[PDB]
Design a protein around this ligand. Structure first.
Ligand SMILES: *[C@@H]1O[C@H](CO)[C@@H](O[C@@H]2O[C@H](CO)[C@@H](O[C@H]3O[C@H](CO)[C@@H](O)[C@H](O)[C@@H]3O)[C@H](O)[C@H]2NC(C)=O)[C@H](O)[C@H]1NC(C)=O
Lengths: 215, 56, 56, 221
């Protein structure tokens, strides 16, 4: 087996700059005078895509991708970095079965710090007739990735019943989004009033959105 | 002409290049002329090149 | 192939800081895509009736 | 074109067997070796095997030699893979891929047949509209929603106005809640358009033959 090790594991690069992802082969992948390395691009949520064959030549692939290297170590250079470049990049060798891939490198775009467009939602009436309560709270289109949702029921905090879900960095605007559902039973629910959703970002030095049970 | 034979057929033709616009008129009434030949493979349109050349 | 008209195609190599100028008022079959000669090397056009074998 | 149409997402009881298919189209089936790739959910690509249609020769990975079986239907212009006696391990996505020429690159990758191995029963979802608070309005633009809760197995498709709205839309990834999936969608239209504009949420869950529509009615207050 020719163990392929990519570095670094995750790379965050500013828009319009240079991404430089490396590959390192345990033994050479390089005879007949050519390198049998290949780079692959997996844009989130879809199958991988072929970028470079035999380590240097582009497959309908923009010139921004520089395939380089020889022998034991190579490098995919993306420069200039564009918006639609969020993906995980893979190098795979064909020099010798069994075909082996790299760990893969995930690329993230650094953009303008955007603020979370919070919005809180009461549980459906149809759901409540079924017996359960679900307080949903979206936190769309923001950057950096890190965010911190807090739930408060009548001033007192709560973690149990919470389910969070982030989307991948959007290929088009480079902004994350987040769901944050809070599930309870009708009776557990009807024993309180105010439901809050305190998001603490680096953008605002807490963003809040809440609603009261009886209106 | 449609070659109905079973063989390739060698066909020859020609164009006349006169001395002056006068000779042109005397022989073929029309002043500007062409010859177009068409085949599955052949496509040409010849235009006579009037000039004064030495007598041969 | 049903058609009795003909199309005649041409090519040229456009050197790296040179430009190609088309001017036409009809019958023009225009380029949309051209080909960058990325790798020149020693190769060949082999006339054969066979197809790939997945071997080396 | 070089399209590779493959089988639809599948669910298998642990210990059973699957047979996902990949239908070739647009090139000569018999000129290229077809291969299969397994991707452990958002992790790493693994090579399974290869088969050359024209004579049916197979080439396997050590790892999959046993559990896998590539076969080819020449008249059908179709490649098949079969996974026998599955485990949680095999729950991942499988790509039917055309490799160009032992020393070759995979140039045309198929969609991906995604396999889910669980003893769990098939469960239709429940869809709930998300109208904003009766006394609060986000300024120039109004965010609207749709909630899909309690279904199995993946996946589901969420559309807005049968698909004609494709702009401000975010469909978030599903999550596991009491051993069922749950996800949400967020359409964002200009404040003037709603509630004047018909905003309908169109959700589909193939696994249960379910197609549901929910219209976002403003807060009755
Ligand atoms: C095809 O495009 C080319 C680039 O737009 C063009 O070349 C340009 O030619 C100009 C003069 O016409 C050069 O002007 C100056 O060049 C350098 C500065 O780097 C100095 O020696 C002088 O100050 C000089 O005046 C441009 O630099 C040059 N640009 C590039 C990028 O090479 C071609 O001439 C165009 N060709 C045709 C056939 O139209």
């Amino acid at each position: 087996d020719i163990v392929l090790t990519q570095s670094p594991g995750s790379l965050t690069v500013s828009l319009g700059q240079r991404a430089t992802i490396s590959c390192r082969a345990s033994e050479s992948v390089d005879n007949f005078g050519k390198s049998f390395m290949h780079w692959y691009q997996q844009k989130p949520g879809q199958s991988p895509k072929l970028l470079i064959y035999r380590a240097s030549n582009r497959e309908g692939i923009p010139a921004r991708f520089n395939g380089s290297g020889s022998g034991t170590d190579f490098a995919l250079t993306i420069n200039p970095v564009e918006a639609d470049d969020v993906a995980t990049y893979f190098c795979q060798q064909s020099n010798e079965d069994p075909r082996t891939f790299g760990g893969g490198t995930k690329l993230e775009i650094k953009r303008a710090d955007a603020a979370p467009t919070v919005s809180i939602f009461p549980p459906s009436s149809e759901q409540l007739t079924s017996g359960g309560a679900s307080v949903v709270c979206f936190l769309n289109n923001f950057y950096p990735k890190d965010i911190n949702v807090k739930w408060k029921i009548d001033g007192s905090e709560r973690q149990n019943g919470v389910l969070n879900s982030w989307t991948d960095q959007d290929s088009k605007d480079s902004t994350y989004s987040m769901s944050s559902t809070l599930t309870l039973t009708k009776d557990e629910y009807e024993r309180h009033n105010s439901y809050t959703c305190e998001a603490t970002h680096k953008t605002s030095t807490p963003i809040v959105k809440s609603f009261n049970r009886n209106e | 002409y449609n070659n109905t034979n079973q063989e390739d057929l060698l066909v020859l033709w020609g164009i006349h290049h006169p001395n002056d616009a006068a000779e042109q008129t005397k022989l073929y009434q029309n002043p500007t002329t062409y010859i177009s030949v068409g085949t599955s493979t052949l496509n040409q349109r010849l235009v006579p090149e009037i000039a004064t050349r030495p007598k041969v | 192939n049903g058609q009795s008209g003909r199309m005649e195609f041409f090519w040229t190599i456009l050197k790296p800081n040179d430009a190609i100028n088309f001017e036409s008022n009809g019958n023009f079959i225009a380029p949309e895509y051209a080909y960058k000669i990325v790798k020149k090397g020693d190769s060949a056009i082999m006339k054969s009736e066979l197809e790939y074998g997945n071997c080396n | 074109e070089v399209h590779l149409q493959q089988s639809g997402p599948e669910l298998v009881k642990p210990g059973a067997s699957v047979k996902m298919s990949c239908k070739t189209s647009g090139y000569t089936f018999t000129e290229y070796t077809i291969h299969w790739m397994k991707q452990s959910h958002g992790k790493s690509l693994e090579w399974i095997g290869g088969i050359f249609p024209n004579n049916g020769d197979t080439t396997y990975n050590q790892k999959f030699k046993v559990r896998a079986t590539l076969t080819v239907g020449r008249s059908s212009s179709t490649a098949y893979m079969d996974l026998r006696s599955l485990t949680s391990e095999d729950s991942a996505v499988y790509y039917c891929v055309r490799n160009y020429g032992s020393y070759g690159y995979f140039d045309v990758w198929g969609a991906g047949t995604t396999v889910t191995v669980s003893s769990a029963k098939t469960t239709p979802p429940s869809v709930y509209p998300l109208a904003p608070g009766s006394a609060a309005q986000t300024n120039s633009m109004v965010t609207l929603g749709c909630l899909v809760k309690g279904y199995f197995p993946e996946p589901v498709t969420v559309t807005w106005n049968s698909g004609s709205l494709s702009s401000g839309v975010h469909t978030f990834p599903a999550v596991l809640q009491s051993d069922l999936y749950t996800l949400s969608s967020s359409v964002t239209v200009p404040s003037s358009t709603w509630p004047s504009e018909t905003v309908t949420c169109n959700v589909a869950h193939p696994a249960s033959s379910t197609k549901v529509d929910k219209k976002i009615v403003p807060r009755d207050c």
